[PDB]
C-alpha cells in the first residue's frame, strides 16, 4: 500500500494519476488477502487500525462524498470503499465507479458486514470462535475495540484468556516444498508455528519505522540497520521488526531474525511474547516506534536506551520547559493560548513575530 503526504502540500492536486505522488509504501504478508490487506492498513502509519470510517453514517451527503472519492481516487480511496458499503452502495455500484476487480471488492464488503456484527454484539458477543474468526480475517485488536467500544487492551486480554495468539510462518520461495534455514517470518492466525525461537542467545529487538514518509526517511532505517549489524557482530541474536519493502532493514541478510510485520503495539507484543528478548530498541525507527515506547514498557517490554519517560520529558513541551528552566537554559519566550484574545494579549507579552505551533 503506498504512503502519501498530501497533508504537507495543501494547494496540490491530490488525485491519483499516472504520475507518482506517493512518498513511500508498506507491505504485508497474510495467509489470506483479507488478512494481508488489513495488516497492511494497520502497518501504514496513518493512524488507521484497518477500515476506519471516513464519513458519518448520519451524513445526508455521505453517498455523494463517497461517490466522488470512488470515482476519482485520492489517497483515501480504500477507506471510502468500506464507507460505500456501510452507506448502502452495492459491489456492482462500487465496481462501476472504481474499476477495482470485484474479487477484491467482495472481500472488503464482507469485512464491513463482519464489523456490523461486532458493533451489534459488543464485547459480549466476542466469544472464542467469533474472535478467532475475526482475527483470521486480519482484524486488529484496536479496530475490534472501537467497534465494541472498549479499550484495545481489553480485546488483547480477551485473546490472552482464550489463548488466541497468532502463529508464525516463514518465507521460503517454494510454498513449503523445501526447508529453510532462514527465519523470515510473518504472523497469521493458524495452527502450526514456525518461529522456533532460540533459548541459546541473548536477544535484541530493533523496531523499524514502517513505510517512509516525509520526515521519516531512509535515515532512520540506516540507523536500524547499523544497530542490527553492530549488535550481531557483538554476538547478540538480532531481531528486526519492520514492514517497509524498500529497505535493507527488511533484507533477511541484515539480521538474525526478521519479523515482516506492522510496527504496532499489537504486533510487537506478540513477538516479544514468544521471543522474550533481553532488550528492545525503540529509538532508532523514527516516530513510529517512538510512540509505542510507553505502552511497550507498560506491558513489561524490556525497552533499552533512553527511557520512555525520558523520551516524554523531551517530547512534552511543558516537561521540556521545566527541564530547561531547571537547567537555567535560554529558550524563546512562550505561552499556551486557549482563546483568540488570550492570544493577542499573550502575544504582546511574547512579542512578535510569532511561531504558532498547534
Amino acid at each position: 500500500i503506498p504512503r502519501f503526504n498530501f497533508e504537507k502540500f495543501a494547494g496540490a492536486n491530490d488525485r491519483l494519476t499516472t504520475q507518482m505522488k506517493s512518498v513511500g509504501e508498506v507491505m504485508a504478508i497474510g495467509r489470506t488477502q483479507q488478512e494481508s490487506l488489513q495488516k497492511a492498513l494497520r502497518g501504514l502509519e496513518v493512524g488507521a487500525t484497518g477500515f476506519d470510517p471516513k464519513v458519518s453514517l448520519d451524513d445526508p451527503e455521505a453517498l455523494t462524498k463517497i461517490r466522488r472519492e470512488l470515482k476519482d481516487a485520492g489517497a483515501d480511496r480504500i477507506w471510502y470503499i468500506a464507507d460505500a458499503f456501510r452507506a448502502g452502495l452495492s459491489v456492482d455500484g462500487v465496481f462501476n465507479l472504481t474499476n477495482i476487480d470485484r474479487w477484491f471488492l467482495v472481500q472488503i464488503e464482507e469485512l464491513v458486514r463482519l464489523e456490523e456484527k461486532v458493533a451489534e454484539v459488543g464485547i459480549t458477543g466476542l466469544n472464542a470462535d467469533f474472535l478467532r474468526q475475526l482475527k483470521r480475517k486480519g482484524f486488529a485488536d484496536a479496530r475490534l475495540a472501537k467497534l465494541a467500544g472498549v479499550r484495545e487492551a481489553e480485546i488483547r486480554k480477551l485473546r490472552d484468556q482464550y489463548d488466541l495468539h497468532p502463529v508464525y510462518k516463514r518465507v521460503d520461495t517454494c510454498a513449503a516444498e523445501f526447508a529453510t534455514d532462514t527465519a523470515y517470518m510473518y504472523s497469521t492466525y493458524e495452527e502450526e508455528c514456525e518461529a522456533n525461537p532460540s533459548t541459546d542467545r541473548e536477544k535484541i529487538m530493533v523496531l523499524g519505522g514502517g513505510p517512509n514518509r516525509i520526515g521519516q526517511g531512509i535515515e532512520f532505517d540506516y540507523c536500524c540497520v547499523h544497530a542490527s549489524l553492530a549488535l550481531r557482530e557483538d554476538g547478540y541474536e538480532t531481531i528486526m521488526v519492520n514492514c517497509n519493502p524498500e529497505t535493507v532493514s527488511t533484507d533477511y541478510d541484515t539480521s538474525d531474525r526478521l519479523y515482516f510485520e506492522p510496527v504496532t503495539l499489537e504486533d510487537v507484543l506478540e513477538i516479544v511474547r514468544i521471543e522474550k528478548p533481553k532488550g528492545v530498541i525503540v529509538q532508532y525507527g523514527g516516530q513510529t516506534p517512538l510512540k509505542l515506547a510507553r505502552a511497550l514498557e507498560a506491558a513489561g517490554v524490556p525497552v533499552i536506551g533512553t527511557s520512555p519517560d525520558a523520551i516524554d520529558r523531551a517530547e512534552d513541551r511543558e516537561r521540556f520547559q521545566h527541564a530547561v528552566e531547571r537547567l537555567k537554559l535560554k529558550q524563546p519566550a512562550n505561552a499556551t493560548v486557549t482563546a483568540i484574545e488570550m492570544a493577542v494579549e499573550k502575544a504582546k507579552e511574547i512579542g512578535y513575530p510569532l511561531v504558532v505551533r498547534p
Binding site: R31, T32, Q33, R102, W103, C174, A176, A179
Partner: protein, 379 residues
C-alpha cells in the same frame, strides 16, 4: 456450519469446512504448488485415488470452465484448500468452484492449515488420508479409513481410467480468440499416431494434433500386435495414475514395439513404462513432484526449462541399462527426467511437455517426436 474433516494415516487431524459434496474420500494425500491451474489439476486422471492439497491459499478465483478440463471428469479423490473465495471473477468462468465440486460429487475441505499439511508431507512423506464432510465428522472413523487404505505402491491405476474402447482424436489446441477449435478432418493430418490411454490428458492429444498427428486412442491393455496392424507412424505412451510397475501388459507391448523401428514417445507414466520395458527400475518417491515451477536441465544442451510435474514414482538412474541415455534431470533434486534409447528411436520425459496447467517451456519435446516420425516415414 458445514463441517469437514481430514485425517491422515498418522492420526493428524485438520478441521475445516465443507466446500464440495457430502460424504467421505480416501486416497493418497499429495500437495501441489501451482498458483494457477487448479481446474486442469483436478481433471487430471493422474490424480486418481489421490486427495489433492493446493499450497496456494485462494483456490477458485477464476471459477471454472469446460476448456479448462483435462479429461471428461474430476479425477481427484478429494480437494484440500486454505480458502474458497466468495466469488469467481474471470470472463471465462461458467461455474463457481463449489458448485462445480458438488456437481462432480467431490468431497472437498477448505479452511485448514495447508502449510502445516504440506510441511508434514514433505518432511514425513506421502500419507494416505480421509476427508469426511458432513454433520458430525467421526475422526476415529476417518482415521480408520485412512489407515485401511491400501496405498498407491504396486497399485495399477492405468487400467481403471483407460478408455473402454478405442477412438479417434483430431482436435487441436485452444486459442484466446478462437477457444477450443473444431476437430480436424482426418485428411488434414499428415501423421497417424496410436496412443495408449493410461489416463491421458486432453492437452497431450491437442498438442500432438497441432503438430500434424491424427490419433487413435487405445485402451491401456491393447496388444502390440493389434497395434502394429494399424500401421502407425508413431507410438505415444500417455500419462496416468498409480504404479507403472504392475502394468505388465504395457511393458510387454512396449517391448514388442521396441523390436521395431517405430518411433516411441512417453510422458510421465509412459516414460516409466518405457524405462521398464528397457530394463530400467522405478521407485516411488518420498512425496513426489507436483507443481508448475520445477527446474529441469536438458543435460545435452545445458539449458534449463521450468516445468509442470505430476509424479509420485521415478525411474532409477543408477539402474539404467546401457541402451538408455539420460537426457534430462531435475534441478530441484537431480532425479531422472528424460531418457532416450541409444539404439532405438524411443525417448521420454518425466514432466509434462503439454503443461496444462503450466509453463510451455518443455513443449519442444514433442517436436523431437515429430522429427522421428517424419524420418520414420522417409523409410
Amino acid at each position: 456450519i458445514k463441517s469437514a474433516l481430514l485425517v491422515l494415516e498418522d492420526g493428524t487431524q485438520f478441521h475445516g469446512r465443507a466446500i464440495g459434496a457430502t460424504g467421505s474420500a480416501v486416497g493418497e494425500v499429495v500437495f501441489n504448488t501451482s498458483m494457477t491451474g487448479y481446474q486442469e489439476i483436478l481433471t487430471d486422471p493422474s490424480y486418481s485415488r489421490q486427495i489433492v492439497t493446493l499450497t496456494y491459499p485462494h483456490i477458485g478465483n477464476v471459477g471454472t470452465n469446460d476448456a479448462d478440463e483435462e479429461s471428461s471428469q474430476v479425477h481427484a479423490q478429494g480437494l484440500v484448500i486454505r480458502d474458497l473465495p466468495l466469488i469467481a471473477s474471470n470472463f471465462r468462468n461458467t461455474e463457481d468452484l463449489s458448485s462445480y465440486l458438488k456437481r462432480h460429487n467431490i468431497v472437498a475441505i477448505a479452511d485448514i492449515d495447508t502449510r502445516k499439511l504440506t510441511r508434514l508431507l514433505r518432511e514425513k512423506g506421502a500419507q494416505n488420508g480421509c476427508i469426511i464432510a458432513g454433520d458430525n465428522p467421526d475422526a476415529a472413523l476417518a482415521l480408520e479409513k485412512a489407515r485401511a487404505f491400501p496405498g498407491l505402491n504396486g497399485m495399477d491405476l492405468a487400467k481403471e481410467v483407460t478408455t473402454a474402447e478405442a477412438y479417434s482424436w483430431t482436435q487441436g489446441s485452444w486459442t484466446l480468440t478462437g477457444g477450443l477449435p473444431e476437430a480436424k478432418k482426418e485428411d488434414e493430418l499428415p501423421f497417424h499416431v496410436v496412443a495408449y490411454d493410461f489416463g491421458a490428458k486432453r492437452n497431450i492429444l491437442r498438442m500432438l494434433v497441432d503438430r500434424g498427428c491424427r490419433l487413435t486412442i487405445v485402451p491401456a491393455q491393447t496388444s502390440a500386435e493389434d497395434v502394429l496392424k494399424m500401421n502407425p507412424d508413431g507410438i505415444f505412451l500417455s500419462n496416468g495414475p498409480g504404479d507403472p510397475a504392475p502394468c505388465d501388459y504395457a511393458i510387454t507391448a512396449i517391448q514388442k514395439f521396441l523390436e521395431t523401428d517405430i518411433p516411441v514417445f512417453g510422458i510421465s507414466l509412459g516414460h516409466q513404462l518405457l524405462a521398464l520395458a528397457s530394463g530400467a527400475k522405478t521407485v516411488k518417491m518420498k512425496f513426489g513432484h507436483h507443481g508448475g515451477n520445477h527446474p529441469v536441465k536438458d543435460v545435452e544442451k545445458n539449458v534449463v526449462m521450468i516445468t509442470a510435474q505430476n509424479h509420485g514414482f521415478a525411474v532409477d538412474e543408477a539402474t539404467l541399462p546401457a541402451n538408455l541415455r539420460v537426457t534430462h534431470k531435475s534441478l530441484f533434486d537431480g532425479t531422472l527426467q528424460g531418457i532416450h534409447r541409444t539404439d532405438k528411436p524411443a525417448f521420454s520425459f518425466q514432466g509434462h511437455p503439454e503443461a496444462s496447467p503450466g509453463p510451455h517451456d518443455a513443449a519442444p519435446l514433442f517436436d523431437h517426436f515429430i522429427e522421428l516420425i517424419e524420418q520414420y516415414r522417409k523409410t
